[PDB]
Write an enzyme that holds these catalytic residues in place. Structure first.
Site, PDB file in Angstrom:
ATOM      1  N   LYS A  91       5.500 -76.684  -4.963  1.00  0.00           N
ATOM      2  CA  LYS A  91       6.473 -77.548  -5.605  1.00  0.00           C
ATOM      3  C   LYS A  91       7.710 -77.678  -4.724  1.00  0.00           C
ATOM      4  O   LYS A  91       8.358 -78.714  -4.718  1.00  0.00           O
ATOM      5  CB  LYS A  91       6.871 -76.990  -6.967  1.00  0.00           C
ATOM      6  CG  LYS A  91       7.882 -77.852  -7.688  1.00  0.00           C
ATOM      7  CD  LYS A  91       8.940 -77.020  -8.378  1.00  0.00           C
ATOM      8  CE  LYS A  91       8.409 -76.418  -9.661  1.00  0.00           C
ATOM      9  NZ  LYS A  91       9.303 -75.351 -10.204  1.00  0.00           N
ATOM     10  N   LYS A 166     -16.732 -80.318  24.736  1.00  0.00           N
ATOM     11  CA  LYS A 166     -16.522 -80.465  23.333  1.00  0.00           C
ATOM     12  C   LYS A 166     -16.751 -81.910  22.882  1.00  0.00           C
ATOM     13  O   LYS A 166     -16.486 -82.865  23.670  1.00  0.00           O
ATOM     14  CB  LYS A 166     -15.136 -79.993  22.863  1.00  0.00           C
ATOM     15  CG  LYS A 166     -14.020 -80.918  23.266  1.00  0.00           C
ATOM     16  CD  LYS A 166     -12.630 -80.306  22.869  1.00  0.00           C
ATOM     17  CE  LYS A 166     -12.132 -80.808  21.488  1.00  0.00           C
ATOM     18  NZ  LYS A 166     -12.357 -82.237  21.350  1.00  0.00           N
ATOM     19  N   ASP A 167     -17.229 -82.100  21.656  1.00  0.00           N
ATOM     20  CA  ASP A 167     -17.314 -83.448  21.110  1.00  0.00           C
ATOM     21  C   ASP A 167     -15.898 -83.940  20.979  1.00  0.00           C
ATOM     22  O   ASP A 167     -14.991 -83.136  20.785  1.00  0.00           O
ATOM     23  CB  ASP A 167     -17.898 -83.448  19.707  1.00  0.00           C
ATOM     24  CG  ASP A 167     -19.403 -83.455  19.680  1.00  0.00           C
ATOM     25  OD1 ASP A 167     -20.066 -83.834  20.690  1.00  0.00           O
ATOM     26  OD2 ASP A 167     -19.922 -83.107  18.598  1.00  0.00           O
TER      27      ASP A 167
HETATM   28 CA   LIG Z   1       5.048 -75.446 -12.272  1.00  0.00          CA
HETATM   29 CA   LIG Z   2     -10.097 -86.296  21.128  1.00  0.00          CA
END
Ligand SMILES: [Ca+2]
Ligand SMILES: [Ca+2]
Ligand SMILES: [Ca+2]
Ligand SMILES: [Ca+2]
Ligand SMILES: [Cl-]
Lengths: 399, 397
Positions: A91, A166-167
């Site tokens: 919150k 890496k992909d």
């Molecule tokens: Ca609350």
């Molecule tokens: Ca990328």
């Protein structure tokens, strides 16, 4: 016995003390209840406290910028990122101009999170790469390509001797090549190529699909011989990634990608600091390698966040340390500076550095290894590049 | 908005003459990466669909909007594929903010949507033709199960439709979620023979991800009226699995916790209506909690109108009930009627527990205000025979 969070916020001076007290009580016990004597004292131990209020600046319009520290008793948490985040910036994240700057976490709470399964030492052991930065290449193009076309593209990168490919993190469509078929296929190509390079180049495959089948897919991908799982951690959520890092059957390193994180840290006055998002939280969640914007690209994290980030990944603690993989502006000419910034425990996270090389990806990879050689032997790059055409071309294009 | 693509609008700052190059690079870079096989892969390539200059700076910079079309074919039906595509690497490119997503029905239908929606929640509670009244626990952590049962009772004695855990309630050391649901359900039934209403209970859904679905089912089977979910904290795909699961046969109540970290700044992140409206309905919230226009910090008028539209616009999925929060007191009820109509949850915390006569009168004062509106009698007039409403007017006006 508590998580101490530091917030940076704008408000009026005479409201700070009440606002802080409201936070400390409202986000812990909610409010005091009409209980008998004994009960109050017992409930009290669940209540938060204001640890500090620091005015940073007073604006001519009467507003102040201040830091407030709030202590949240650990007994109200339940060992998940959800409980942690909803408590410290749930919150509260919506309360106008306010930003979470620091989390000081007690040992008891840190130990309820998994931490990296492999860490620095375990990645090195899996890949057999020691006493040097690691080299990683990224697919220039994925979507739309056939498995055969993909394989060739993988081969070009691996022919440069890279430790890891890496992909691209945007690779989601499984219409031409499923993740499981990619792992199988790149494995074989890697085997062929190792006969010339002397290294079997590993594959980091994008971990994708619905949450409920994610852990089973991670397990299959490991079993099939994936070198690492590429995970968009922030998109999926930290608790999601935590379960993967905790599962023994997910027997493969996690490569944490920062996609989406900038939506949390980009603003100087709202959100959560980048070192928390990409550093502290990533190590807790179980990243073995952490990708984050370098100080060398167009948009950086800034010095202060970048240092804090690294210290989060490396600080002595109960969890294994994480390999930093700083992104953008990574070229062979930068290698010596990178040694100075990070030491040998580093992933050279190359993209355009590999594919932008005049002589192709193969040469683009060799270039980084040439610079690694130069550093190891105290040789100036320009000097080394007299006998190494790859480095030579790389020095030409990017300095 | 093209039938084959999601079109995202970005507000960003850049040099004037750089806009076309940057837009084109985004369109390509975030779809195919880079370039008779062309027409085959061209189906996966994105495109620039708008570039609009908003403001010219003397530093040669411009604030602008750019629209990019992302082919749906490149996505896989998850929020992760959507978010990483339209705002993954892009989220880190300096001053840039995701302002709008225009999504085709073909994409929307890949997501679950609400299981119940407005109409489903009303039938489940049997509450029609009026706003719903929901109370929030004022204190949870550290109280015993019995103390918690008494608290729930006080709120239910006010005759409210729904009582929700505080979203910060995580510790299970005193009363487990399972135990609370069993005990609150039994209490609600005791109180219903005096109030004529069995007050439902929205329980905080908590714990590791790997056991959340199993737990949601258990809590539903034990008789929770709804599951309170910190959607942003867990991730939208986590929550989508919940909404898709037939055995999780209870409404989902979306709490916005952590969302401000994404939308708070004017120049970065993702617009609040996307985070708390568009994305929530796709993920399956039946009731959606978001900051009202009547507390200290709002979403602003424009965002709020956009958010409410995402929740209500006719489409493939069921509509969501709005639960605006902050500044919710009986005195505001006529205004809330005007802004929201009867498809509204009156989401009171302080409005109920802060009543001079305690939680029972706090809720009673809300039904008093509802009676007064239904009958066109001004609250000041209605309070003459309605002490609960009278005291609420005295305190908050
Ligand atoms: Ca609350
Ligand atoms: Ca990328
Ligand atoms: Ca561990
Ligand atoms: Ca559906
Ligand atoms: Cl800002």
């Amino acid at each position: 016995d508590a998580v101490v969070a530091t917030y940076r916020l704008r408000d009026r001076k005479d409201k700070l003390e009440a606002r802080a007290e409201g936070i400390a009580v409202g986000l812990t016990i909610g409010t005091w209840t009409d209980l008998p004597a004994a009960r109050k004292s017992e409930v009290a131990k669940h209540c938060g406290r204001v640890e500090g209020i620091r005015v940073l600046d007073e604006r001519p319009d009467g507003d102040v910028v201040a830091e407030i520290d709030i202590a949240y008793p650990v007994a109200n948490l339940n060992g998940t990122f959800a409980s942690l985040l909803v408590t410290v910036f749930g919150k509260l994240s919506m309360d106008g101009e306010i930003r979470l700057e620091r989390l000081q976490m007690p040992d008891e709470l840190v130990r309820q999170f998994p931490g990296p399964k492999f860490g620095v030492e375990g990645v090195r052991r899996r890949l057999g790469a020691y006493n040097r930065p690691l080299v990683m290449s990224i697919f220039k193009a994925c979507a739309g390509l056939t498995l055969d076309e993909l394989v060739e593209a993988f081969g070009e990168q691996a022919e440069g001797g890279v430790d890891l490919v890496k992909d691209d993190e945007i690779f989601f469509t499984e219409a031409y090549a499923t993740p499981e078929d990619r792992v199988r296929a790149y494995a074989a190509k890697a085997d062929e190529i190792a006969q010339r390079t002397g290294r079997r180049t590993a594959y980091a495959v994008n971990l994708t699909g619905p949450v409920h089948s994610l852990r089973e897919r991670a397990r299959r991908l490991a079993e099939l011989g994936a070198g690492a799982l590429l995970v968009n951690v922030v998109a999926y959520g930290y608790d999601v990634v935590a379960d993967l890092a905790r599962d023994p059957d997910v027997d493969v390193p996690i490569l944490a990608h920062p996609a989406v994180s900038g939506a949390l840290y980009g603003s100087p006055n709202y959100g959560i600091a980048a070192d928390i998002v990409l550093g502290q939280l990533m190590r807790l969640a179980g990243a073995d390698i952490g990708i984050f914007p370098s100080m060398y690209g167009s948009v950086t994290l800034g010095r202060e966040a970048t240092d804090r980030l690294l210290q989060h990944l490396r600080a002595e603690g109960p969890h294994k340390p994480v390999l930093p993989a700083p992104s953008a502006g990574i070229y062979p000419g930068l290698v010596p500076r990178l040694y100075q910034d990070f030491g040998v425990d580093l992933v050279l996270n190359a993209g355009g550095g590999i594919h932008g090389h005049p002589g192709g990806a193969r040469m683009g990879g060799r270039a980084f290894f040439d610079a690694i050689w130069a550093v190891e032997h105290g040789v100036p790059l320009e000097e080394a590049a007299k006998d190494r055409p790859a480095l030579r071309q790389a020095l030409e294009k990017w300095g």
